[PDB]
């Protein structure tokens, strides 16, 4: 009465356990045999009735507690607990369960009863579940426009029999094919799957625009679905929905097993808020079928809506100055740090994505080199010669660098000494006297170098160590915290020289280079980046010296301006302009001869109303991330002073 109700707790634990883990059988194998006052039924009926009930509610992590086994009669123990239960429509909590055991011989079983299913049920009650399933929510722009939204797509598709015998059927199909852009081996194999039936709707393509004249066996219909209104332009960012899997509902029952779940960016970040809760009533029937119990009801609460920093229109623009080539634009206004555009390309189509997609169109996305999946402005690089601007900040703000100073440069390479063997920083222009100014408007790495070696590791990185490297941002996007190098210490001058202008170890993905070179923006105080468009603005103060903004700035506007600027082709639109222009190299290992990357820092200094970040990756020849950024920066200065 002591070891035999110790043996007791451990055969309820354990019932429970089997339960708990879907394992059926073995729960039932704890039961007693047959009987009046032993088990209702026998084993094989136990285990379909939990089968049965358990796996129509999706029933998830049966957790007990207030464990209790007492003695009733003299080879009779009664048990009883508390218990919870995840189900298809939310959490089931405070149920009180009972029982009874049973030591026959050596072992100790169950009096199985049907009130070890749902406590109230008896003999034999049936269980009914009633679900509702909710809407997704939209996913907006700033000034509501839809990025991801609930639409009325219009499905071509066809019907076997109405489509022909012989010859008749192959002219159709040569109709559908021309007059729809879809391939006529491919509408063959479509309707000749293995589930078609002669009078089916073979579903083909989601037609977009207006629909054309109609041969025979073809046909539309309405159906609901997913839409995003900007497509490629911000596939990365938003993402798609894809049908859900009964995985998908094994790890979570709180899903609709009919819905759609999001499989990658905002889609799958916010997929909880987005996609409502599931309504109904599960409850608990007599023989017959009439209600007895509800054990959860509540109605169907529909997904709450998202509303974003980005502006649509600027999204669409920096996606298509693009051009196809790989490549990322963050757009924001600095003084506040709303994201007004993430684009990255190349990218995929998420209508095509999420309304079906062939085996071949998603093997060449991830077969294409240049990879259109990635989201590149969350992706870390080496932020390139664009970082010249910290460095010098920097160097003004502990002294090292006189703006007036001017360091004398013999030709194009450059290396501290002989230590340094067959390496030497490069620079593309050849200008013998080089102060601050000139090394900003030519792009000059060997300045910068020589400054970053005077200056030296630990007043380097304490002018680093100001900003976010190392820091996790509050943001829904995936993303790896910037960092200055590899480990804690350089360990090497040609190391903190390339670092010194940007290339090194260095790892700042798109997002956070808005955030680092905002402190231009804000006299030197760093404004996190947001993309919520309800979230506090956040910022970090003191960040880089007010005296180091102003003497860099004007230096900026340089960079535009100057006939001999690396920006100057940006003149051209006669607007108040600072920039930075940057080039990165890579080691690209299947192309031993070289990648080079091209980066663009613009924003507006008179009344830091927006900036942008550019780049260019594995550049092509004679192209660059500024002469693609007219068209963006035009429509930035318009619209956000």
């Known amino acids: 009465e002591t070891q035999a109700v110790e043996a007791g707790e451990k055969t309820v634990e354990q019932f429970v356990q089997a339960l708990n883990k879907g394992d059926y059988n073995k729960a039932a194998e704890m039961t007693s045999k047959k009987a009046?006052?032993?088990?209702?039924?026998?084993?094989?009926?136990?285990?379909?009735?939990?089968?049965?009930?358990?796996?129509?509610?999706?029933?998830?992590?049966?957790?007990?507690?207030?464990?209790?086994?007492?003695?009733?009669?003299?080879?009779?123990?009664?048990?009883?607990?508390?218990?919870?239960?995840?189900?298809?429509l939310g959490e089931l909590k405070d149920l009180s369960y009972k029982g009874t055991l049973d030591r026959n011989d050596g072992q100790t079983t169950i009096n199985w009863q049907p009130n070890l299913v749902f406590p109230e049920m008896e003999g034999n009650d049936k269980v009914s579940l009633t679900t509702q399933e909710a809407a997704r929510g939209n996913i907006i722009d700033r000034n509501g426009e839809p990025l991801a939204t609930t639409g009325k797509l219009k499905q071509l598709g066809?019907?076997?029999?109405?489509?022909?015998?012989?010859?008749?059927?192959?002219?159709?199909?040569?109709?559908?094919?021309?007059?729809?852009?879809?391939?006529?081996?491919?509408?063959?194999?479509?309707?000749?799957?293995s589930w078609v039936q002669p009078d089916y709707f073979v579903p083909l393509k989601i037609i977009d625009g207006a629909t054309?004249?109609?041969?025979?066996?073809?046909?539309?219909?309405?159906?609901?679905?997913?839409?995003?209104?900007?497509?490629?332009?911000?596939?990365?960012?938003?993402?798609?929905?894809?049908?859900?899997?009964?995985?998908?509902?094994?790890?979570?029952?709180?899903?609709?097993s009919n819905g759609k779940i999001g499989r990658s960016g905002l889609e799958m970040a916010f997929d909880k808020d987005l996609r409502g809760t599931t309504g109904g009533?599960?409850?608990?029937?007599?023989?017959?079928?009439?209600?007895?119990?509800?054990?959860?009801?509540?109605?169907?609460?529909?997904?709450?809506?998202?509303?974003?920093?980005?502006?649509?229109?600027?999204?669409?623009?920096?996606?298509?100055?693009?051009?196809?080539?790989?490549?990322?634009?963050?757009?924001?206004?600095?003084?506040?740090?709303?994201?007004?555009?993430?684009?990255?390309s190349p990218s995929y189509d998420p209508n095509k994505?999420?309304?079906?997609?062939?085996?071949?169109?998603?093997?060449?996305?991830?077969?294409?080199?240049?990879?259109?999946?990635?989201?590149?402005?969350?992706?870390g690089y080496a932020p390139g010669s664009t970082f010249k601007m910290i460095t010098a900040a920097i160097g003004l703000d502990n002294g090292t660098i006189d703006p007036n100073e001017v360091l004398t440069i013999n030709g194009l390479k450059w290396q501290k000494d002989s230590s340094w063997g067959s390496y030497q920083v490069t620079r593309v222009s050849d200008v013998s006297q080089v102060d601050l100014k000139t090394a900003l408007i030519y792009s000059d790495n060997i300045y910068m170098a020589q400054?970053?070696?005077?200056?030296?590791?630990?007043?380097?990185?304490?002018?680093?160590?100001?900003?976010?490297?190392?820091e996790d941002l509050d943001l829904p996007i995936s993303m790896n915290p910037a960092q200055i190098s590899n480990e804690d210490s350089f360990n090497s001058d040609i190391l903190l020289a390339d670092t010194?202008?940007?290339?090194?170890?260095?790892?700042?993905?798109?997002?956070?280079?808005?955030?680092?070179?905002?402190?231009?923006?804000?006299?030197?105080?760093?404004?996190?980046?947001?993309?919520?468009?309800?979230?506090?603005?956040?910022?970090?103060?003191?960040?880089?010296?007010?005296?180091?903004?102003?003497?860099?700035?004007?230096?900026?506007?340089?960079?535009?301006?100057?006939?001999?600027?690396?920006?100057?082709?940006?003149?051209?639109l006669?607007?108040?302009?600072?920039?930075?222009?940057?080039?990165?190299?890579?080691?690209?290992?299947?192309?031993?001869?070289?990648?080079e990357n091209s980066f663009l820092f613009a924003f507006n200094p008179d009344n830091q109303g927006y900036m942008m970040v550019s780049m260019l990756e594995n550049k092509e020849d004679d192209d660059s991330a500024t002469k693609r950024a007219s068209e963006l920066l035009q429509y930035l200065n318009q619209n956000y002073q």
């Open 500 to 572: 010194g202008y940007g290339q090194g170890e260095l790892l700042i993905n798109p997002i956070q280079q808005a955030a680092m070179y905002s402190v231009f923006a804000n006299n030197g105080t760093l404004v996190y980046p947001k993309l919520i468009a309800d979230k506090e603005t956040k910022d970090k103060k003191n960040v880089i010296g007010e005296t180091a903004v102003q003497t860099i700035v004007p230096d900026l506007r340089e960079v535009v301006q100057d006939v001999n600027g690396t920006a100057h082709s940006l003149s051209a």
């Open 281 to 344: 009533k599960l409850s608990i029937t007599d023989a017959d079928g009439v209600e007895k119990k509800v054990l959860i009801e509540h109605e169907v609460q529909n997904g709450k809506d998202i509303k974003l920093t980005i502006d649509a229109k600027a999204q669409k623009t920096a996606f298509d100055s693009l051009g196809g080539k790989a490549g990322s634009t963050v757009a924001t206004t600095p003084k506040t740090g709303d994201l007004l555009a993430l684009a990255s």
């Open 451 to 470: 400054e970053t070696l005077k200056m030296g590791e630990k007043k380097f990185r304490t002018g680093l160590d100001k900003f976010i490297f190392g």
């Open 158 to 193: 066809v019907v076997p029999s109405k489509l022909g015998d012989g010859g008749e059927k192959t002219a159709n199909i040569k109709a559908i094919a021309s007059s729809f852009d879809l391939t006529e081996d491919a509408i063959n194999q479509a309707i000749s799957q």
């Open 353 to 379: 994505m999420t309304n079906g997609i062939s085996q071949e169109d998603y093997k060449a996305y991830e077969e294409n080199p240049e990879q259109p999946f990635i989201s590149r402005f969350a992706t």
């Open 574 to 595: 006669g607007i108040p302009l600072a920039a930075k222009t940057g080039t990165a190299e890579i080691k690209e290992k299947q192309d031993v001869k070289g990648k």
């Open 36 to 88: 009046a006052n032993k088990s209702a039924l026998s084993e094989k009926e136990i285990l379909d009735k939990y089968q049965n009930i358990y796996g129509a509610a999706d029933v998830k992590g049966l957790q007990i507690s207030n464990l209790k086994v007492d003695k009733k009669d003299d080879s009779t123990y009664s048990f009883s607990y508390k218990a919870k239960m995840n189900t298809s």
């Open 212 to 256: 054309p004249e109609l041969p025979a066996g073809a046909t539309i219909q309405e159906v609901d679905g997913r839409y995003y209104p900007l497509g490629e332009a911000a596939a990365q960012l938003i993402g798609y929905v894809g049908d859900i899997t009964a995985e998908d509902i094994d790890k979570n029952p709180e899903l609709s």
